[PDB]
Structures are given as structure tokens and as C-alpha cells.
């Protein structure tokens, strides 16, 4: 039970990290893309 909730919270944190990182890279490209 605890391992599944651990993996689920890890997936949520990883999703937040990945989405924010991709958005940051998009804004950066756009800075170089005006």
C-alpha cells in the first residue's frame, strides 16, 4: 500500500517538474526566438 502511494506521489512530483521544465525551455527558446 505504502509503496504504491509513494510511486504515485513520485509520479505527480515528476509530472510537475517535467511540465514546468518544458514550459521554461519553451519560454527560453522563445526569448531566442523573440
Amino acid at each position: 500500500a505504502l509503496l504504491n502511494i509513494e510511486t504515485e506521489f513520485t509520479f505527480l512530483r515528476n509530472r510537475l517538474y517535467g511540465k514546468k521544465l518544458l514550459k521554461l525551455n519553451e519560454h527560453e527558446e522563445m526569448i531566442q526566438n523573440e
Binding site: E6, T10, L24
Partner: protein, 31 residues
């Protein structure tokens, strides 16, 4: 500004990882 935002975001993601591990530990203890 974008660099600062990205570093704040990296910090936030690491903190959320620590929070996920802590919530998992509390759930395991409550089991």
C-alpha cells in the same frame, strides 16, 4: 528572470519530491 524562475522551479520540484517521500513514510507508518 527566466533563469531565476527555472532555478526556483528546480528547488520547488526537489521540495515536492521530499514532501512525497515524507508523505509516503507517514502513510507507511500509519499502516
Amino acid at each position: 528572470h527566466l533563469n531565476e524562475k527555472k532555478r526556483k522551479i528546480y528547488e520547488a520540484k526537489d521540495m515536492f519530491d521530499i514532501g512525497s517521500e515524507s508523505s509516503t513514510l507517514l502513510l507507511h507508518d500509519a499502516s
